[PDB]
Design a protein around this ligand. Structure first.
Ligand SMILES: CCCCCCCCCCCCCCCCCC(=O)OC[C@H](COP(=O)([O-])OCC(O)COP(=O)([O-])OC[C@@H](COC(=O)CCCCCCCCCCCCCCCCC)OC(=O)CCCCCCCCCCCCCCCCC)OC(=O)CCCCCCCCCCCCCCCCC
Ligand SMILES: CCCCCCCCCCCCCCCCCC(=O)OC[C@H](COP(=O)([O-])OCC(O)COP(=O)([O-])OC[C@@H](COC(=O)CCCCCCCCCCCCCCCCC)OC(=O)CCCCCCCCCCCCCCCCC)OC(=O)CCCCCCCCCCCCCCCCC
Ligand SMILES: CCCCCCCCCCCCCCCCCC(=O)OC[C@H](COP(=O)([O-])OCC(O)COP(=O)([O-])OC[C@@H](COC(=O)CCCCCCCCCCCCCCCCC)OC(=O)CCCCCCCCCCCCCCCCC)OC(=O)CCCCCCCCCCCCCCCCC
Ligand code: HEA
Ligand code: HEA
Ligand SMILES: CCCCCCCC/C=C/CCCCCCCC(=O)OC[C@H](COP(=O)(O)OCCN)OC(=O)CCCCCCC/C=C/CCCCCCCC
Ligand SMILES: CCCCCCCC/C=C\CCCCCCCC(=O)OC[C@H](COP(=O)(O)OCCN)OC(=O)CCCCCCC/C=C\CCCCCCCC
Ligand SMILES: CCCCCCCC/C=C\CCCCCCCC(=O)OC[C@H](COP(=O)(O)OCCN)OC(=O)CCCCCCC/C=C\CCCCCCCC
Ligand SMILES: CCCCCCCC/C=C\CCCCCCCC(=O)OC[C@H](COP(=O)(O)OCCN)OC(=O)CCCCCCC/C=C\CCCCCCCC
Ligand code: CUA
Ligand SMILES: [O-][O-]
Ligand SMILES: [Cu+2]
Ligand SMILES: [K+]
Ligand SMILES: [Mg+2]
Lengths: 131, 47, 100, 60, 90, 100, 65, 49, 61, 186, 459
């Protein structure tokens, strides 16, 4: 029956169902670094998140075992193929938190940093709307 | 947020989540017990 | 002649272990209130309804499940081009006549 | 003998007490990580060689 | 015997300790049952232990609570010290 | 309307009204792989009954995205379109009960 | 025999030929080379140099040398 | 009996870190409440390079 | 690192607080970089600061 | 412990006694070649291992560790929703595994989890109750504990009513402060 | 003859000799690592040859564990004194003893040859899939070495177990230490072989265990089910040595012999059931995590009893006896150093603390303090005690206070800073790092070069 597939009434009335956006985050090369960038930690696309919000991070690894580590957020979850591990977080202060892959993943294990920037909820909404 | 030079950061530094604070305090809670275990044992290493 | 193990050790610890496992499992089910009635079927309600229609004669016999869905994948489109349920039923009817 | 036996008891059970003193804290912090929270947003993170892919819901 | 110097067990309970081999077996069995019971009677029991209106308040809790209640410290401690983010710049 | 309406009807409803929260059937474990597979199977069964254009099935896909990474969904969605997805084979063409 | 009483009698009685010691040290030296030589070979194979110059994979000042 | 001196010496040295931890928690409670180092509506997204 | 800066101030106010980072070099190439400069970065940084000042005045409005 | 072989050793009846141990100790022994020598060696071992007071401490530790171990294994098999030994549910797609889904919520709420979660305020200084409220209802609503965890938590006051800043660091006061700025909902 | 000899004492010498030789390669790799980590940049490895660093750390770990410390503490000292301690003429299985040492050498030659001939890539000494199974042939060669090493370890374990059948005296604590390690090997090795065969099947037989729908976490369970028992197979022989040295040099009978023995048995049983403390960050179930964390902390109890029983052995000893002998100093240093390593182990045992400290140099320093300092010093102390019996000379070690002091100071300069960078945090198994971690990395590097220089003064 249609009711065996629960859907909120707003969407049944024509509300747009949300889409998803994917982006790739890569290390900034040594020759591409700018005067102020932190070597071995900067990336070309950061992950922006709102502060004072409960966020669920689902982490997996496509090919080999990586590990998503953000020391300031107290997160170190192994990105293992076949496991979609749930990590809940609640950021309390704005800033930019830098991390690095924490599982030997091949030649460039040392060259895939993790940069997360936490901004005010009003700022995050504007950013998400534009990007 | 980011490592800083010549920092001990014993137990962690700059938490930005309630869980991060928990981790730092768990280490700080046990640290005096570790010191007691060490000092109490080492003091008797002698003839 | 001196004994090291229980005189009936093999049967004792084999059947005994099985008994403890079975009894402990019943106790565990009672504490969590787990339904203990075995169902051998799938629970897709719409599918089970289509199957009743076949048993009632509303849907012709040997009609494939992809002949009843509102979305077909590519491989099932390939099959639909060669599907003839009416011919299949006639063939089965002929077999029954020959057998009897 | 009596004194020695008491020391040996302490050599074993003083560590046991310390372990028991950590046990309760360990349970609590483990329970805290695995707490069902009312999360309102999801960020999917995939790790590839050698970069991190991020999937986020787009504003409607 | 739990947290018991067995030298004491040998002295005060000589007949119960006469067979030291059997005594050792009971030591193992008793602590085995204690560990087993903890898992299935302290940890496992479902939907229990969530009565937070029944937090035990020991005699020491009340001694210290009444002492602060008698003075103004309890009221002062519970008062919210700041409920604004920014101070006003003159 | 009822306070416990979400639990009533199905366990599925809970995450349908709160997409970014734990599903009752998988909240005990951090690994959410099985959660993703159930959500995809539910999207597959919706289309068979209602079609791809139905808003319900479109939302069942959004729900699947909430727990399934894109690289897995794209692969599994290709298998589904070809007709090789094991979570979408029509039940009368399954082999799970054959030869054992 | 008295000569056979002690294991490795020549060495224990301090009469052994020094070449035995030299071979042992040489064997250890060769073992060490298995970590250095492939390092040099691999560096040249993928770069063209046997060893790098400190911080030559990063941006350097004009006067850096 | 001497081993007791070690217990007492290890209890004194341990208590020093207890006091540091005690003061640390007091400081942490005042960060989000009073510390001017805590700033909000401050960090702006950098954007893709 | 706002909590490292706050905690340093609190500790220093209470008693004698000594940081290695304050006295010692953080990199080993300091022995050779007494007079080293990146002049291209200097010009770019100055230009960006000038643009920032214009943006600040505009934002003030 | 007698020193003369003439003086018998007391034994209880059962499967772990002095008599039971004597019967089996010398089964694989090449040294117990006659009664006198066998008894001497048997009593030598019994004296050394069973009349040693500190040895009984390890007996307690092995029992406790093994009991926990057996029980955690059994609990997984009997109650964990993700451990399958029967196959009925494994012969069905995920949406149809109702009997296995019945283990989920009871297994999500063990007693010790309800008893110890309120004590997070002994590890968190700011907003220790940040995750207490949840409108769904899979788990109970959480209330912060009134006392510190017993043991090594000397850095915090024995009772939280003693702490001056405790109330001002709560997620409720923090929400008030930020809501007054229009900064965030939580 | 040389290769044909079956003498158990000669074979014991061979094990020590080969451990030192292979050890030279191990130390060289360690120097490469520390040199590279001296600053940020590339120092001795090109950015295009980063695969070599991954191979250096992998081989360092594997060689030091399986080809140096294990052959030295479980093959060397054991084969020389165990048959004497057991007042038996010779080892029970003479021909098996000969083949075991030959097997170790042959597996070493295979490994080093694979460095020279194969492409140099690394996947850690823990050979986690899928990375291990998508590599080149050097991984296949390393697997052959491990399997071959496993054969030697198991047959040597069988050899020691047979001493129970022939021992003509009392089973001393040291004999108990080896027997229990042998039991740990007999129970752990067969599981390792199985998982290694599965790695081979995926590498060489088109198996699919470590690709989607197959759980890669499976490998970690079976590997670490051998992994952690291995760390106690490497430490327990060291404990046995420490007991003999302290009793002999202090002229004091072992106190609580039965508690020492029962502590070793306890550590083994517990060590066989705590392996998943290496898998805390994978995402295991809450109850599993709590079980493993609880049982891991229990291991401290039996381990603590042994430490305190050692202390009372040194207490009260006669003052007239000279206490500056290198063997005595090393034995005492072991107690001081092992406590540091163990306490840090208890810290990392708390899983929530472990989230921050997994795959960081804090873990490195933890197991170095126990192995690179504690186990090495224990093997040195044991050999030094048996200098007269073994009969080696041409070294200045027996009475060398400079060597002991310099070693202790400099070894701590290397690994104490690695605890600090664990809260900085500097991940493990990396070569490049942020510029704000140079200070501590530089200090440790200065410590490594210095320790090597002190190794030359013994000759
Ligand atoms: C960690 C380090 C620091 C440690 C510090 C702490 C140490 C604490 C103390 C430890 C003590 C442990 C216990 C010790 C017990 C000792 C017992 C003993 O002595 O036993 C007796 C035993 C034998 O004595 P014996 O009973 O008289 O034996 C008589 C013979 O059996 C019969 O006599 P023979 O003359 O007839 O002998 C036959 C001889 C015949 O010999 C000859 O004819 C030799 C001719 C000269 C050759 C010289 C070498 C030439 C090399 C050329 C290289 C050219 C390179 C060109 C490159 C060009 C590049 C462009 O040899 C052979 O035919 C075969 C030789 C095979 C072995 C040598 C292999 C060398 C390496 C090969 C590598 C190959 C790689 C191939 C790769 C291929 C890839 C495709 O002694 C030894 O074997 C010597 C031991 C010496 C050391 C003892 C320990 C001393 C204390 C420690 C010191 C520190 C050592 C540190 C390690 C080394 C660092 C480098
Ligand atoms: C039996 C017997 O006749 O043994 C001697 C007999 C030799 O005859 P003998 O001439 O009388 O020997 C002279 C003595 O050796 C010389 O001994 P002694 O006269 O100097 O001292 C008296 C006593 C001295 O010894 C004793 O009295 C010790 C007795 C206690 C041993 C420890 C038991 C385990 C710890 C407690 C566990 C509690 C669990 C609680 C669970 C509760 C659950 C509710 O002798 C013996 O008991 C000698 C035999 C010792 C056998 C040790 C076998 C391995 C033990 C492994 C322990 C557990 C390792 C766990 C690893 C991790 C697992 C996950 O042994 C054999 O025939 C050896 C066979 C070896 C086969 C190995 C391969 C097996 C597969
Ligand atoms: C068309 C084809 C059709 C099909 C055809 C199919 C055909 C099928 C054939 C099947 C069979 C083939 C194999 C036959 C084997 C026969 C064995 C036999 O019965 O021999 C009796 C025969 C008895 O000899 P003999 O005729 O009575 O007279 C012998 C002499 O008088 C000498 O008297 P000795 O025995 O007293 O002297 C021995 C000793 C004399 O001692 C010395 O040379 C001086 C003292 C020692 C110096 C210090 C050495 C370092 C410390 C080592 C410590 C551990 C030692 C462990 C024990 C030795 C293990 C080898 O020195 C040595 O020879 C070796 C010493 C140790 C060398 C290794 C040390 C480590 C070096 C690491 C370097 C790299 C890092 O055995 C021997 O003496 C020689 C055996 C040689 C076996 C060699 C196997 C080598 C395998 C290497 C790895 C292979 C893979 C990779 C290779 C890559 C190459 C590029
Ligand atoms: C011989 C080497 C050795 C030894 C003895 C130990 C001993 C211990 N180790 Fe191990 N460990 C390693 C070698 C060793 N370890 C290695 C090599 C790794 C990394 C492998 C890799 O990841 O690649 C590792 C990793 C490792 C981790 C992984 C951390 C991570 O991956 O992030 C953990 C955490 O549980 C751990 C814990 C322990 C514990 C709890 C002990 C206990 O045995 C310590 C017991 C000793 C004491 C506790 C001190 C003495 C006792 C007392 C003084 C009594 C009083 C003390 C108390 C009451 C607490 N070890
Ligand atoms: C017991 C094994 C052992 C020993 C002795 C050592 C010794 C040393 N190790 Fe160790 N190391 C490991 C086992 C060991 N290591 C393992 C298992 C890893 C992890 C591998 C991985 O990450 O995959 C590791 C990782 C490791 C790294 C991490 C690299 C990385 O992954 O990023 C570093 C450098 O920081 C390092 C440095 C050193 C140094 C400087 C020494 C020593 O040089 C310090 C100085 C001491 C000496 C020079 C004396 C040693 C002498 C002997 C061993 C011979 C003894 C023989 C007799 C007594 C007969 N080691
Ligand atoms: C000899 C005569 C013929 C006997 C023929 C027997 C044939 C079948 C044998 C199968 C293997 C043995 C177990 C049989 C179990 C039968 C009952 C059963 O189905 O149990 C199911 C039940 C769980 O089923 P699900 O509902 O699918 O899961 C719900 C969520 N967890 O599983 C079990 O209880 C069986 C599996 C565990 C068996 C062992 C007991 C568990 C504890 C093991 C402890 C191990 C450590 C050491 C213990 C030492 C002694 C205390
Ligand atoms: C003497 C010893 C007993 C002293 C008294 C203890 C006592 O009564 O404690 C009560 C107190 C609760 O009191 P309140 O919070 O004030 O009220 C409840 C509000 N909901 O309980 C506690 O603090 C918790 C006690 C927990 C004991 C746990 C024992 C071990 C359990 C298993 C641990 C894990 C084993 C391994 C993993 C198993 C996985 C299945
Ligand atoms: C210079 C580096 C260190 C060289 C060194 O110490 O080598 C020692 C070692 C053993 O020599 P002795 O100890 O004197 O033994 C002979 C009998 N007494 O000498 C050699 O092996 C000589 C050849 C070294 C080649 C190194 C490349
Ligand atoms: C030494 C010989 C005895 C070893 C016994 C070890 C048993 C330890 C018990 C650990 C435990 O609780 O097991 C959980 C743990 C898995 O936990 P999760 O991955 O979180 O999955 C749980 C629900 N999905 O179980 C295992 O991995 C068991 C591995 C099998 C061990 C078999 C040993 C065989 C020895 C012969
Ligand atoms: Cu990815 Cu490391
Ligand atoms: O490994 O401990
Ligand atoms: Cu371990
Ligand atoms: K570097
Ligand atoms: Mg890891």
């Amino acid at each position: 029956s249609p009711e065996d597939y629960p859907t909120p009434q707003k969407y049944l009335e024509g509300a747009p169902i949300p889409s998803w956006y994917s982006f790739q985050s890569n290390l900034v090369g040594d020759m591409d670094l700018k005067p102020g960038m932190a070597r071995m930690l900067e990336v070309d696309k950061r992950l922006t998140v709102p502060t004072r919000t409960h966020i669920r991070f689902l982490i997996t690894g496509a090919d080999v075992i990586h590990s998503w580590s953000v020391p300031s957020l107290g997160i170190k979850c192994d990105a293992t193929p076949g496991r979609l591990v749930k990590i809940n977080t609640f950021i309390q202060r704005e800033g930019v938190f830098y991390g690095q892959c924490s599982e030997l993943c091949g030649t460039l294990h040392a060259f895939m940093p993790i940069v997360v920037e936490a901004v005010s909820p009003e700022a995050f909404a504007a950013h998400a709307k534009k990007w | 947020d980011i490592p800083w030079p010549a920092r001990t950061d014993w137990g962690g530094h700059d938490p930005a989540t309630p869980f991060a604070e928990l981790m730092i305090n768990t280490h700080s809670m046990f640290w005096p017990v570790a010191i007691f275990i060490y000092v109490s044992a080492i003091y008797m290493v002698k003839k | 002649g001196r004994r090291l193990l229980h005189g009936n050790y093999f049967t004792r610890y084999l059947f005994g272990s099985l008994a403890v496992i079975w009894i402990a499992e019943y106790a565990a089910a009672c504490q969590y209130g787990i339904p203990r009635h075995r169902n051998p079927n799938w629970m897709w309600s719409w599918w089970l309804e289509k199957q009743n229609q076949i048993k009632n004669g509303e849907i012709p016999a040997n009609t494939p499940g992809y002949a009843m869905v509102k979305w077909n994948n590519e491989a099932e489109q390939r099959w639909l081009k060669t599907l003839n349920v009416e011919a299949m039923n006639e063939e089965f009817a002929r077999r029954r006549e020959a057998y009897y | 003998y009596n004194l020695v036996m008491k020391v040996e008891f302490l050599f074993f059970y003083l560590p046991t007490i310390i372990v028991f003193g950590i046990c309760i804290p360990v349970y609590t912090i483990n329970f805290a990580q695995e707490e069902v929270i009312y999360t309102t947003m999801t960020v999917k993170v995939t790790g590839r060689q050698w970069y991190w892919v991020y999937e986020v819901e787009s504003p409607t | 015997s739990i947290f018991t110097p067995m030298d004491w067990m040998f002295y005060y309970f000589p007949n119960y300790s006469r067979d030291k081999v059997a005594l050792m077996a009971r030591q193992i069995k008793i602590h085995f049952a204690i560990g087993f019971a903890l898992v299935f009677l302290v940890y496992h029991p479902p939907y229990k232990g969530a009565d937070y209106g029944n937090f035990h308040k020991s005699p020491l809790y009340w001694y210290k609570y009444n002492q602060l209640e008698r003075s103004g410290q309890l009221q002062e401690n519970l008062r919210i010290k700041r409920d604004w983010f920014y101070d006003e710049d003159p | 309307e009822s306070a416990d309406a979400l639990f009533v009807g199905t366990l599925d409803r809970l995450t349908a009204e709160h997409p970014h929260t734990d599903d009752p059937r998988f909240a005990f474990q951090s690994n959410q792989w099985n959660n993703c597979e159930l959500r995809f199977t539910q999207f597959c069964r919706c289309t068979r009954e209602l079609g791809e254009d139905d808003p319900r099935c479109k939302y069942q896909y959004y729900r699947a995205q909430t727990v399934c990474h894109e690289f897995l969904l794209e692969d599994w969605m290709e298998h589904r379109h070809r007709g090789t997805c094991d979570l979408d084979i029509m039940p009368d063409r399954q082999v799970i009960h054959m030869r054992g | 025999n008295l000569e056979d009483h002690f294991d490795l009698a020549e060495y224990m009685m301090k009469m052994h030929n020094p070449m035995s010691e030299y071979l042992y040290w040489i064997a250890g030296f060769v073992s060490g080379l298995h970590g250095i030589l492939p390092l040099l070979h691999s560096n040249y194979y993928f770069s063209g140099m046997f060893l790098p110059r400190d911080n030559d994979n990063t941006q350097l000042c004009d006067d850096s040398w | 009996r001497d081993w007791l001196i070690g217990v007492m010496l290890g209890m004194y040295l341990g208590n020093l870190c207890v006091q540091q931890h005690r003061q640390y928690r007091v400081d942490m409670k005042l960060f989000y409440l009073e510390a001017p180092e805590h700033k909000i509506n401050w960090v702006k997204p950098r954007g893709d390079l | 690192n706002p909590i490292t800066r706050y905690l340093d101030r609190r500790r220093a106010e209470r008693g004698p607080y000594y940081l290695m980072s304050n006295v010692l070099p953080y990199h080993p190439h300091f022995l050779w970089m007494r007079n080293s400069h990146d002049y291209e970065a200097a010009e770019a940084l100055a230009a960006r600061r000038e643009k920032d000042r214009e943006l600040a005045a505009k934002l003030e409005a | 412990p007698p020193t003369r072989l003439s003086t018998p050793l007391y034994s209880e009846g059962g499967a772990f006694t002095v008599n039971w141990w004597r019967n089996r100790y010398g089964l694989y022994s090449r040294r117990q070649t006659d009664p006198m020598l066998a008894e001497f060696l048997f009593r030598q071992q019994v004296k050394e291992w069973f009349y040693d007071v500190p040895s009984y401490n390890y007996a307690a530790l092995v029992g406790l560790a093994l009991g926990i171990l057996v029980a955690v294994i059994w609990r997984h098999f009997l109650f964990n929703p993700d451990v399958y030994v029967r196959r009925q549910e494994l012969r069905k797609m995920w949406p149809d595994r109702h009997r296995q889904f019945a283990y989920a919520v009871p297994y999500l709420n063990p007693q010790l989890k309800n008893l110890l979660l309120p004590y997070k305020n002994s590890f968190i200084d700011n907003e220790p109750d940040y995750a207490d409220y949840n409108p769904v209802g899979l788990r109970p609503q959480r209330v912060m504990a009134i006392r510190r965890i017993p043991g090594f938590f000397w850095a915090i006051p024995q009772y939280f009513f003693e702490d001056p800043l405790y109330t001002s660091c709560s997620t409720k006061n923090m929400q008030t402060i930020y809501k007054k700025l229009g900064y965030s909902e939580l | 003859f040389y290769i044909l000899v079956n003498n158990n004492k000669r074979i014991g010498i061979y094990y020590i000799k080969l451990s030192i030789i292979i050890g030279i390669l191990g130390i060289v790799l360690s120097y490469i690592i520390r040199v590279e980590l001296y600053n940020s940049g590339n120092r001795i490895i090109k950015y295009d040859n980063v695969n070599y660093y991954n191979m250096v750390i992998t081989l360092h770990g594997l060689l030091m564990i399986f080809y140096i410390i294990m052959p030295g503490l479980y093959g060397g000292i054991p084969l020389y004194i165990l048959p004497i301690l057991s007042v038996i003429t010779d080892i029970v299985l003479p021909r098996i003893n000969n083949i075991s040492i030959i097997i170790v050498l042959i597996s070493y030659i295979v490994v080093i040859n694979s460095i020279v001939i194969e492409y140099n890539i690394g996947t850690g000494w823990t050979l986690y899939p899928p990375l291990s199974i998508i590599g080149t042939v050097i991984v296949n060669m390393i697997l052959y070495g491990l399997i071959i090493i496993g054969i030697s370890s198991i047959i040597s374990a069988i050899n020691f177990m047979n001493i129970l059948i022939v021992i003509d005296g009392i089973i001393y604590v040291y004999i108990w230490s080896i027997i229990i390690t042998s039991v740990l090997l007999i129970i752990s090795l067969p599981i390792l072989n199985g998982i290694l065969l599965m790695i081979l099947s995926d590498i060489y037989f088109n198996s699919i265990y470590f690709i989607l729908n197959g759980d890669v976490v499976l490998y970690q369970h079976l590997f670490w089910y051998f992994g952690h028992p291995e760390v106690y197979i490497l430490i327990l022989p060291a404990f046995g040595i420490i007991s003999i040295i302290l009793s002999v040099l202090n002229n004091k009978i072992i106190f609580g012999m039965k508690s020492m023995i029962l502590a070793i048995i306890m550590i083994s049983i517990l060590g066989s059931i705590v392996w998943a403390h290496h898998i805390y960050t994978v995402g295991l179930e809450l109850d599993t995590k709590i079980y493993f964390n609880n049982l891991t902390l229990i291991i401290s109890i039996p381990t603590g009893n042994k430490i305190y029983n050692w202390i009372i052995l040194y207490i009260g000893s006669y003052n007239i006896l000279y206490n500056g002998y290198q063997s005595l100093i090393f034995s005492i240093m072991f107690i001081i150093i092992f406590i540091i390593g163990g306490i840090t182990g208890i810290i990392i045992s708390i899983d929530i603390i472990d989230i921050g400290l997994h795959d960081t140099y804090y873990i490195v320093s933890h197991f170095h303090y126990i192995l690179s300092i504690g186990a090495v010093i224990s093997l040195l102390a044991g050999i030094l005690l048996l200098k007269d019996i073994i009969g080696y000379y041409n070294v200045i070690i027996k009475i060398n206070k400079y060597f002991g002091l310099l070693l202790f100071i400099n070894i701590n300069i290397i690994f104490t800073p690695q605890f600090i960078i664990g809260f900085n945090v500097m991940p493990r198994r990396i070569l490049e790092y942020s510029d704000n971690i140079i200070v501590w990395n530089l200090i440790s590097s200065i410590g490594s070069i210095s320790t090597i220089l002190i190794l030359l003064s013994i000759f």
